[PDB]
């Protein structure tokens, strides 16, 4: 049974706007991506998560992720100064504009309700909404408040079974699985 490798899954399989997001953000920590292509794959994953998140409703969030960090922390900044919103202490991946708060989005392989409580206590905020994934369907979210609805989800959570199975497909699941933090 053949082994692929995960950088062939990877531009293959995701976006090439996404990859060279990925790419710079890889760059930007200083992180070889031909080394730790299990991380490669987690953030383009990521990267895809947060925008089906923002383009499931056109208009209503501002996309902070993918953004190189000045720049990530001079629109978090603006943000603040416009609507009135307390500053992160981390940059957040998303604001939403309808229920006025910075979102961040969490894509586990791990159980994540402990993923859940991990992100909880290292934000640090009061403030800022929690929305966890996992690679089998299982979400979880502050105050049991989900934001989109079931279709918009169901749409991610698609998404990311289609990502294991292709991945499981190609002998890679088994590592990237056992690969987080
Ligand atoms: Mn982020
Ligand atoms: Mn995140």
């Known amino acids: ?3 692929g490798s995960m950088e062939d899954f990877v531009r293959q399989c995701f976006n090439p ?4 997001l990925a790419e710079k953000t890889m760059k930007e920590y200083g992180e070889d991506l031909k080394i730790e292509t299990n ?6 994953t990521h990267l895809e998560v947060c ?22 922390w001079t629109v978090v900044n603006s943000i603040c100064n416009t609507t009135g919103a307390e500053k992160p202490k981390f940059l957040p991946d998303l604001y939403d504009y309808k229920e006025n708060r910075f979102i961040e989005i969490g894509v586990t392989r791990r159980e994540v309700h402990i993923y ?3 992100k909880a206590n290292k934000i640090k905020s009061e403030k800022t909404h929690i929305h966890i994934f996992s690679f089998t ?3 979880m979210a502050t105050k049991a408040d989900y934001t989109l609805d079931e279709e918009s989800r169901a749409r991610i959570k698609t998404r990311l079974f289609t990502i ?18």
Not at 39 to 44: L, M, P
Not at 61 to 69: C, M, S, T, V, Y
Not at 164 to 181: K, N, P, T, V, Y
């Open 137 to 139: 369907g299982e979400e």
């Open 116 to 118: 859940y409580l991990e």
């Open 17 to 20: 706007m996404i990859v060279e």
């Open 164 to 181: 294991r199975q292709e991945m499981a497909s190609r002998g890679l699941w088994d590592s990237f699985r056992q690969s987080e933090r």
């Open 1 to 3: 049974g053949p082994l």
């Open 51 to 72: 925008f089906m998140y923002s383009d499931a409703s056109k208009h209503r969030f501002e996309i902070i992720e993918g953004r190189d960090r000045t720049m990530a």
């Open 39 to 44: 991380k490669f794959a987690a953030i383009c």
